Design a protein around this ligand. Structure first.
Ligand SMILES: Nc1ncnc2c1ncn2[C@@H]1O[C@H](COP(=O)(O)OP(=O)(O)OP(=O)(O)O)[C@@H](O)[C@H]1O
Ligand SMILES: Nc1ncnc2c1ncn2[C@@H]1O[C@H](COP(=O)(O)OP(=O)(O)OP(=O)(O)O)[C@@H](O)[C@H]1O
Ligand SMILES: Nc1ncnc2c1ncn2[C@@H]1O[C@H](COP(=O)(O)OP(=O)(O)O)[C@@H](O)[C@H]1O
Ligand SMILES: Nc1ncnc2c1ncn2[C@@H]1O[C@H](COP(=O)(O)OP(=O)(O)O)[C@@H](O)[C@H]1O
Ligand SMILES: [Mg+2]
Lengths: 272, 1478, 143
């Protein structure tokens, strides 16, 4: 049948597109002590398992397409799901937008695996100290809130502080013109919608979304001071559907601006 | 009757009848008052039991009536019940009034005397002191806003808040010291409510509210009590926002206090506004957010019940409808849980019911139709439903919604830590809550892990208890050293982060897997930096653990020594026992959970002087209805269940079991089917709810533990509600098992001493091989690398090896007994023990794998051992044996050469001994001597059943009962077998099950031990049931719920590999006890021996051919070898072979050689070729395969019979028939064709007339069918496309040869029982009447696998014991007796007539299966016939024969230039008719 | 059959649904505050169309919520003004209505904290004693 050939073509295309393999992080006691290493090792393990599953999936589908394999029950529901163009249930292990089709999911998975490969290569080249200095897209990660928690743990353990007494400061600077403080972590890919941020100062704009160049998460000791009237708390959603709440940032609005207008207009920060 | 005093409507017809009949019996009315009233467990009366003096709670707190109600003055039940409730409400109101006066005296005071305050608290109930505090605070603040009503004035709210603060100070002072638990609960509730009051008052202070009518104050829940109001109902009104509620004033007793988080306050606001608008609320949200607790607290604050129904998948209606209508009449609230989990029909029905109830409630703003009855719904009714993400469409309008998305865990921890008396509660809470978030997120996900809010509450309560214990210890130390005692000073200098860390560790470390403990400590360092805890070792408990381990032959250690991990696990179990009432040891089978808790119980009994008793209940073996209790749907009598019975026995305290430490352990798998009733016990309330409506309080000394090997199918509700101890397999190291085995061998004898001395020498010999990294350890490690037909468990192999070493010691003792003059010396004993140990490792570690893996293990052990081994160049050690003289002797010597009789050729009884048979008999006797159940697993055929049956009949004192397990097998089969062959007897130890006949060891042989299907939760009831008796040595008689000890009963099983279709792998907990031996297909040598014996028996009829027995058998086994090798199962699902084919082959050769008095070797070759073609050629599909078989049979005959002529002995038309002559002789196909056309015409004349055309394929198939119908146990599997003529040919052969045809008339209603009945009728007509039966079967007739199992048993054994039981069995034996009398045989005893009936059935009945192209076992029991489809030749013959009447003769027709030649044998000139048919 | 989109159409639907007698009662400001409630409900329901932006999820802000809000309005206006023809805007229980329609009505279905914050912003912008002025701005910079 024609659909059989089309499925063969798309499976071969995706097999070509998706990277080959993912390398696990080498275990070490000093690395075990570091929390960032633990989080990134968990992410690498999950990503590698999912990548192996998807690759073996595509290989089995291609082999069925040649005709040397019989369609088992799992393969049959798999092929039905593929031809109907919806996301397979087994493939989707991390939180995903509801309406995203298979092709977009495969492209996103390829991007995530590329980021994970870069992260693993950087970790292997150096160690936890180099692992702290990696600019990581929150959308690319499977569990970004785990990354936020890992950064908090690293800051607390480095300076012998308690976790509960640390608060989050966000500094939005360009990638080139950024300073990597011991308590600062580079985060890329955050998109600001409904407003534009300049010199860490929010301004209301009619643009659909403004891309933040490089968001720096700085954990500082709780100053125990009331927040100023010109500060605004913005949600950070995982995707455009706004179904996942990763964390809340605090930004300083510009002069003459009204935070109530920021709340009404649905200004938010998106990982993707 | 129920219309008046609607409060008692809550109970059902059962309790209504009970209270009507026993109205004078007030002592039996306490169960009712438990059912309806709130805190009440019983009503206090005098010795006369005639006047209701007072009321009591289930905890022990009681109220005294100001004016007690005299039942004598009001004999009517309803009148005095109404008087009792009215007086209870009035007493609650008066007590509330005077308590409010007392607390007002307390209020507006600079300082409070702790003694007066504690006296006021002790005088009163927890609910009442909480209400008094609420009223006092509300009145004081109301007067205060009245004062500032002028505005811009001084603030007495500061004074009120300061008063609340000083009350908080004295409260935190009081709870630090030791208090009674009831006073502790009252103090905790007071602290929680006062903390909430302080918070809201500080909020009012910050908001600078100066008007009493300002909404910010109006939103807070206000209580307004009016002492002068005549009606006690109207005295206190609970107003909040615009809603006004009247107090329920029902005695709530003592219940857990819900902290007043902002989410809870918002819930109160929304729910009160909804109730004001006369429609309930629907607080949806995710799991573990306290929505149900919010409903409970809102109801309790208003003095009303809620009944939180549990809406699981298995949900009731009749009792559900009863509790609903009772609630509607009484007016007490009702709440739901997990509503969306209900079934769609269930959901719609409940939605309609609550829709009617809500519509009645709205119309009240009065009776409604409920269960075809009128129900008076009180105005104060409310109903709430909690969802997990929506409301049904008919309810979306009638019901307000609320988002219980998350609870405030930080404030919950702060308030509850302050309740325990902790100082610096804010810091501790803000540390602990994120720590539990990290544990939920960062730690590896596991089935048994749980870090919910309930776990946090348990941790904080345990922390409070540990702080109290530390304070008490410091106080005792200060009493001993010095005299200065002051609670405040010891409280001040007491570390608290250390105490919290100690509680957190004690609670969570036991449930952590091996690799998570460092992660937990890293998390603790991250959250609690620089502060650490040190585990306080239990010195006395460690000493007594050592003593009990010594007594029980268990190895014991401390820290890093052998057994240190196990000892630490036992101590962790002890701590979990201390801090929890519900435990759960989770770990793979073989980690020592059972022995861990048993040793802990024994050590505790020897420590505290409190004797411990343990009840082991297997939930899966017993039905849930019997497990919890049976409520008769019609007679309405309640029969208490097993768990219910043991709980009631504990409660009654007949023999001081309350003083005892009693542990109920649920040894067996867990699923969300029965544990849903236990969820009400594992929680804080701890009560045994019963369908009858009875409630049983859980005693403090009762502990519930579920020794579950895994938690995959367990719901998170159960996991969150009980403590967890993780028992990894690393806990029980192999050296520990070795030491336990050696200690038990050295201490206890096998018989129940010379044999004890023999055991000691044997252990001394094998000690070098059992050490760490010894021979056995390395052999086991390598054996784990191999592949086994069943999943490999370390403890299974170790137990089998230990049992077989026990048999080695028994053999040594027997040798010493049989040679009294020369007992075996030390050197010979050492040689024998070493050789037996090597052989035992060989046959135990790889006793359940193929021969190649056995050879791999043999070569490995030969490489790694120093024990002497046989020097055979290629023969493996396994085929050798260890003689009593300590020498390696081949098993071949033990194999004899018997000669079976002629009339017994290939009879079911005969079992020709061989290498496989003799080795399996030896191992079977070995594992039977220790009475260890064993399973014989192997491919279809292979003689697993005959080997087992012959070995069992060999020993005289062991009787055999065969049990054919089906796909629908249930333990009731085993109970029925026990009833038939055993009986219950009362003994001083207890009730004992033993066989009726004395001095016999009954074996319940299970033919298919893995056939029964597992439930939806992956558990087989029969398997767990058999395991329960295998391990505990008994079970519970469900008739009276009594432990029954098994005596002289043991189990033996057989099965096929689990990879085969329809086979479910056995549980590891069951496999651990049962050694498994793999009965592969007998080797070419074994087949040669057995069928050479069969041939030598067969050929004695004709003496001139006796010399050709050996070459005939050799040719047979060789051809069968290539047949098996070539026609593999991968080509077709039915391409299987076994020795059963050879048995059929020899049986057919016998049956066709018996009529012929003399016969030259050419005829024997011809008959051998005919049977080979009928067995290994017709089952094929492709013509190339058939040509291959013909060529190979030609080559085999030429090779093994060279001095013969191929034309005569192997003429191509090998067609044998009994139709023409009297004997079964070859005949030319032309006479066959003519005679069978004549018989077809007679078939038209007599039976149904449909035109049948005769093509050569029908000739061959009719010949095959006739040949099989002639043979005994002739069962045909007609495999072919529909309409080919399978059924018609079968009927034609049956009619021709005289067998009466029989077909099933199956319809959509045709259940199993009809099939068993029809099989019964067929069996009677074939065995009891000596009348042959042709059983036509088609796969369309098969409706379930059970039919296939019954037919398979019928094909294999010749009959099935299942059909004929009791009266039917007696009727069958009457028929068989009369039939034997008619035939001429006199038989009396049951067994002889049954055997004669079985012989008649196997000789007479012929069942033919027709399927359209599948258990391989079914294929092996029939001779598979390939009908296929009509070929081109066949279709052409049908066409010509049918269209011969029409005249298609056209001389004008001229042959084409090219003629289509689809017909293979078309004549060279097509005429018109052949062209048309083509 | 689906409702016509638009704030205007929603407002006419709301006003036609509510009976004549209920809106014109003893307090003449009841009609004004009912108009404010109708405008708030229309704004919320039309914001529901732009679900990713106007809200976080498609809540069920149906007519039952409007009926409950109107009932709360009537009860509180009865309680504050005991049969009085004219009532000052300051004496109007604004805080009661704001909290009731932020937590119980229109807020019970709100699970996201940010949607609750937006609802509070809308209520505090609309329901205030400053509204009873002729210069009140129901919206700012519409075009
Ligand atoms: N402390 C110990 N030292 C040595 N051997 C032990 C010890 N505890 C138990 N054993 C042995 O190891 C095995 C453990 O059996 P046990 O029934 O306790 O384990 P289990 O994992 O709880 O089993 P199951 O899940 O089948 O009930 C037994 O053979 C027992 O004799
Ligand atoms: N020792 C033996 N004595 C007699 N027959 C034997 C022996 N060993 C194997 N056979 C032959 O092997 C075949 C299989 O024997 P049996 O019917 O007992 O198998 P089974 O274990 O019941 O098979 P299944 O897997 O179907 O349960 C029979 O035809 C039998 O003649
Ligand atoms: N405000 C509160 N005060 C005290 N305990 C609470 C409170 N809220 C929740 N809990 C506790 O947290 C857990 C959550 O309640 P539960 O009924 O299991 O939630 P859900 O119904 O959402 O599954 C329970 O153990 C409950 O007692
Ligand atoms: N040898 C034959 N010649 C002509 N017709 C036949 C022959 N065998 C079967 N039939 C036809 O097949 C029909 C019965 O088919 P049946 O044997 O029940 O199918 P199946 O082979 O699936 O059991 C009869 O009506 C008969 O006409
Ligand atoms: Mg069998």
């Amino acid at each position: 049948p024609a659909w059989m050939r089309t499925l063969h073509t798309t499976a071969s295309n995706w097999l070509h597109l998706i990277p080959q393999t993912l390398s696990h992080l080498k275990r070490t006691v000093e690395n075990i002590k570091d929390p960032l290493f633990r989080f990134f090792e968990r992410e690498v393990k999950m990503g590698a398992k999912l990548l192996q599953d998807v690759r073996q999936d595509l290989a089995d589908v291609v082999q069925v397409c040649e005709g040397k394999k019989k369609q088992t029950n799992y393969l049959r529901t798999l092929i039905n799901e593929l031809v109907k163009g919806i996301l397979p249930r087994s493939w989707s292990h991390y939180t995903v937008p509801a309406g995203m089709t298979v092709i977009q999911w495969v492209s996103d998975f390829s991007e995530r695996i590329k980021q994970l490969q870069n992260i693993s290569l950087a970790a292997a080249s150096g160690g936890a100290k180099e692992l702290k200095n990696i600019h990581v897209c929150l959308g690319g990660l499977f569990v970004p809130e785990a990354y936020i928690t890992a950064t908090r743990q690293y800051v607390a353990q480095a300076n012998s502080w308690s976790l509960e007494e640390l608060c989050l400061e966000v500094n939005v600077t360009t990638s080139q013109g950024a300073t990597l403080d011991a308590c600062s972590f580079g985060v890329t890919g955050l998109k600001l919608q409904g407003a534009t941020c300049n010199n860490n100062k929010l301004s209301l704009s009619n643009a659909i979304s403004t891309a933040l160049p490089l968001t720096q998460l700085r954990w500082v000791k709780q100053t125990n001071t009331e927040k100023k009237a010109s500060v605004v708390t913005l949600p950070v959603y995982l995707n455009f559907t706004r179904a996942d709440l990763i964390f809340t940032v605090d930004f300083e609005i510009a002069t003459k601006e009204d935070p109530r207008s920021f709340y009404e207009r649905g200004v938010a920060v998106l990982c993707t | 009757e129920r219309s008046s005093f609607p409060r008692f409507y809550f109970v059902g017809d059962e309790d209504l009848l009970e209270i009507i009949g026993n109205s004078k019996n007030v002592a039996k009315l306490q169960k009712h008052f438990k059912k309806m009233f709130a805190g009440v467990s019983s009503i206090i009366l005098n010795e006369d039991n005639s006047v209701v003096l007072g009321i009591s709670s289930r905890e022990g707190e009681e109220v005294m009536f100001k004016t007690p109600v005299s039942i004598t003055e009001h004999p009517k039940i309803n009148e005095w019940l109404t008087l009792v409730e009215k007086e209870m409400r009035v007493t609650l109101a008066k007590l509330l009034a005077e308590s409010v006066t007392e607390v007002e005296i307390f209020g507006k005071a600079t300082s409070i005397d702790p003694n007066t305050y504690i006296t006021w608290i002790d005088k009163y109930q927890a609910q009442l002191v909480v209400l008094s505090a609420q009223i006092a605070w509300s009145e004081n603040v109301e007067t205060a806003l009245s004062s500032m009503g002028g505005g811009g004035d001084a603030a007495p709210l500061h004074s009120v808040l300061s008063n609340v603060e000083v009350t908080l100070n004295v409260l935190a002072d009081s709870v630090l010291m030791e208090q009674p638990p009831l006073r502790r609960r009252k103090l905790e509730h007071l602290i929680t409510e006062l903390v909430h009051q302080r918070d809201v008052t500080r909020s009012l202070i910050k908001s600078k509210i100066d008007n009493a009518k300002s909404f910010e104050w109006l939103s807070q829940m206000r209580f307004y009590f009016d002492p002068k109001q005549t009606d006690v109902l109207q005295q206190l009104s609970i107003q909040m926002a615009n809603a006004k509620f009247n107090y329920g004033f029902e005695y709530l007793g003592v219940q857990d206090k819900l902290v007043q988080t902002p989410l809870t306050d918002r819930c109160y606001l929304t729910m009160t506004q909804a109730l004001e608008a006369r429609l309930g609320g629907s607080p949806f949200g995710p799991a573990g957010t306290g929505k149900t607790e919010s409903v409970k607290a809102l109801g309790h604050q208003l003095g009303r019940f809620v009944l939180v129904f549990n809406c699981d998948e298995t949900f009731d209606f009749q009792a559900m409808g009863r509790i609903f209508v009772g609630l509607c009449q009484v007016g007490a609230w009702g709440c739901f849980d997990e509503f969306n989990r209900l079934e769609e029909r269930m959901l719609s029905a409940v939605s309609q019911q609550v829709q009617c109830i809500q519509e009645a409630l709205r119309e009240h703003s009065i009776t409604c139709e409920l269960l075809n009855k009128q129900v008076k719904v009180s105005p104060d009714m409310a109903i709430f439903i909690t969802m997990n993400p929506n409301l049904p469409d008919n309810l979306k309008k009638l019901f307000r919604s609320l988002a219980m998305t998350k609870p405030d865990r930080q404030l919950i921890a702060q308030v509850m830590l302050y309740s325990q008396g902790f100082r610096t509660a804010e810091v501790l809470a803000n540390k602990i809550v994120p720590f539990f978030k990290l544990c939920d997120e960062q730690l590896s996900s596991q089935s048994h892990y749980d870090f919910g809010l309930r776990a946090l509450k348990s941790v904080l309560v345990s922390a409070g208890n540990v702080k109290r214990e530390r304070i008490q210890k410091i106080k005792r130390e200060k009493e001993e050293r010095g005299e200065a005692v002051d609670e405040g000073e010891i409280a001040e200098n007491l570390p608290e982060q250390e105490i919290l860390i100690q509680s957190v560790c004690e609670t969570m470390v036991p449930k952590l897997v091996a690799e998570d403990i460092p992660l937990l400590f890293s998390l603790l360092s991250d959250v609690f930096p620089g502060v650490q805890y040190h585990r306080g070792e239990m010195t006395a408990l460690r000493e007594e653990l050592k003593k009990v381990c010594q007594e029980m032959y268990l190895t014991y250690g401390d820290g890093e020594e052998v057994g240190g991990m196990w000892v630490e696990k036992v101590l962790q179990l002890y701590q979990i026992t201390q801090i929890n009432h519900g435990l759960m040891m989770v770990g793979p089978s073989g980690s020592g959970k059972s022995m861990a808790w048993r040793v802990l119980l024994k050590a505790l009994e020897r420590l505290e002087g409190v004797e411990g008793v343990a009840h082991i209940i297997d939930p899966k073996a017993i039905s849930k209805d019997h497990l919890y209790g049976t409520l008769d749907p019609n007679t309405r009598e309640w029969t208490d269940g097993l768990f219910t019975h043991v709980l009631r026995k504990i409660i009654d305290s007949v023999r001081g079991e309350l003083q005892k430490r009693q542990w109920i352990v649920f040894d067996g798998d867990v699923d969300p089917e029965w544990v849903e009733n236990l969820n009400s016990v594992l929680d804080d309330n701890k009560l045994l709810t019963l369908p009858n409506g009875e409630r049983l309080s859980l005693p403090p000394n009762v502990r519930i533990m579920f020794e579950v090997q895994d938690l995959k199918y367990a719901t998170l509700a159960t996991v969150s509600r009980c403590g967890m101890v993780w028992f990894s397999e690393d806990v029980l190291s192999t050296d520990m098992i070795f030491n336990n085995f050696l200690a038990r061998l050295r201490s206890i004898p096998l018989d129940e001493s010379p044999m004890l001395q023999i055991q000691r020498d044997a252990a001394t010999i094998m000690q070098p091989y059992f050490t760490s990294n010894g021979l056995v350890t390395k052999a086991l490690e390598h054996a784990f690398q191999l592949e086994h037909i069943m999943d490999l468990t370390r403890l299974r192999c170790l137990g089998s090896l230990f049992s077989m070493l026990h048999q080695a010691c028994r053999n040594v003792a027997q040798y010493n007994a049989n040679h009294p003059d020369f007992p075996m010396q030390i050197e010979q004993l050492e040689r024998y023990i070493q050789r037996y140990l090597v052989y035992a490792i060989l046959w135990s570690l790889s006793g359940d794998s193929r021969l190649k893996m056995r050879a791999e293990l043999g070569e490995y052990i030969r490489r790694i051992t120093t024990v002497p081994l046989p020097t055979a160049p290629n023969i493996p050690i396994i085929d050798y044996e260890v003689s009593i003289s300590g020498e390696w002797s081949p098993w071949q010597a033990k194999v004899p050469q018997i000669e079976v009789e002629t009339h017994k050729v290939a009879a079911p009884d005969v079992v020709v001994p061989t290498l496989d048979t003799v080795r399996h008999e030896a191992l079977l006797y070995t594992w039977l001597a220790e009475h260890k159940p064993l399973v014989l697993c192997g491919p279809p055929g292979s003689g697993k059943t005959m080997t087992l049956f012959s070995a069992l009949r060999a020993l005289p004192d062991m009787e055999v009962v065969g049990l054919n397990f089906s796909s629908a097998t249930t333990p009731e089969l085993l109970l029925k077998t026990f009833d038939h062959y055993c009986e219950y007897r009362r003994t001083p130890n207890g009730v004992v099950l033993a066989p009726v006949q004395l001095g016999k060891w009954l074996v319940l042989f299970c033919d298919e031990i893995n056939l029964p299907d597992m439930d939806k939760y992956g558990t087989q009831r029969v398997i767990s049931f058999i395991r329960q008796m295998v391990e505990h040595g008994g079970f519970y008689r469900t008739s009276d719920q009594t432990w029954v000890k098994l005596e002289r009963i043991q189990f033996v099983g057989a099965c096929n590999p689990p990879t085969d279709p329809g086979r479910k792998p056995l549980s590891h907990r069951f496999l651990r006890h049962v050694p498994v031996v793999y009965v592969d297909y007998p080797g070419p040598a074994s087949l040669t021996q057995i069928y050479g014996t069969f041939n030598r028996a067969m050929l004695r009829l004709i003496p001139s051919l006796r010399t050709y027995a050996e070459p005939l058998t050799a040719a047979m086994v060789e051809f069968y070898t290539m047949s098996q090798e070539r026609f593999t199962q991968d080509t077709q699902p039915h391409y299987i072979y076994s020795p059963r084919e050879m048995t059929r082959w020899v049986r057919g050769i016998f049956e066709a050689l018996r009529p012929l008095e003399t016969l030259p070797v050419e005829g024997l070759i011809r008959i051998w070729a005919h049977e080979a073609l009928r067995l290994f050629q017709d089952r094929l599909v492709e013509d190339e395969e058939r040509r291959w078989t013909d060529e190979n049979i030609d080559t085999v005959a030429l090779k093994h019979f060279p001095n013969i002529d191929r034309e005569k002995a192997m003429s191509r038309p090998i067609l044998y028939s009994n139709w023409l002559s009297k004997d079964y002789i070859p005949v030319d196909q032309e006479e066959l064709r003519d005679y069978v056309k004549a018989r077809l015409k007679v078939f038209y004349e007599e039976e149904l007339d449909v035109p049948l055309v005769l093509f050569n394929e029908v000739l061959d198939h009719v010949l095959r069918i006739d040949r099989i119908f002639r043979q005994p146990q002739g069962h045909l599997l007609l495999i072919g496309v529909s309409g080919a003529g399978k059924t018609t040919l079968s009927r034609f052969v049956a009619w021709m040869n005289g067998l009466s045809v029989y077909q099933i008339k199956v319809h959509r209603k045709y259940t199993g029982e009809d099939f068993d009945e029809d099989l019964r009728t067929v069996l009677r007509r074939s065995g009891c009447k000596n009348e042959k039966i042709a059983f036509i079967m088609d796969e369309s007739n098969v409706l379930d696998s059970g039919f296939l199992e019954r037919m398979n048993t019928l094909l294999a054994n010749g009959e099935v014991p299942g059909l004929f039981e009791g009266d039917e069995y007696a009727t069958l034996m009457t028929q068989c007796k009369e039939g034997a009398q008619k035939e001429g045989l006199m038989l009396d005893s049951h067994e002889e007539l049954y055997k004669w009936f079985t012989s008649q059935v196997i000789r007479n009945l012929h069942v033919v299966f027709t399927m359209n192209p599948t258990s391989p076992a079914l294929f092996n029991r029939c001779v598979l016939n390939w009908f296929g489809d009509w070929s081109t030749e066949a279709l052409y013959q049908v066409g010509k024969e049918f269209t011969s009447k029409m005249d298609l003769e056209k001389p004008n027709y001229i042959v084409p230039d090219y003629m289509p030649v689809v017909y293979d044998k078309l004549p060279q000139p097509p005429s018109h008719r052949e062209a048309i048919v083509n | 059959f689906e409702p016509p989109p638009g704030v205007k159409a929603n407002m006419l639907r709301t006003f036609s649904s509510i009976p004549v007698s209920r809106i014109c009662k003893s307090p003449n400001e009841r009609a004004r505050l009912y108009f404010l409630l109708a405008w708030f409900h229309a704004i919320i329901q039309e914001r529901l169309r732009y679900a990713p932006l106007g809200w976080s999820k498609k809540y069920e802000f149906g007519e039952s919520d409007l009926r409950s809000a109107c009932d709360t309005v009537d009860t509180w206006l009865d309680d504050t003004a005991k049969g009085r023809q004219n009532i000052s805007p300051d004496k109007i229980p604004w805080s009661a209505l704001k909290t009731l329609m932020a937590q119980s009505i229109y807020g019970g279905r709100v699970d996201n904290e940010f949607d609750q914050r937006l609802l509070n912003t809308f209520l505090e912008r609309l329901f205030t004693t400053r509204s009873f002025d002729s210069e009140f701005k129901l919206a700012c910079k519409v075009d």
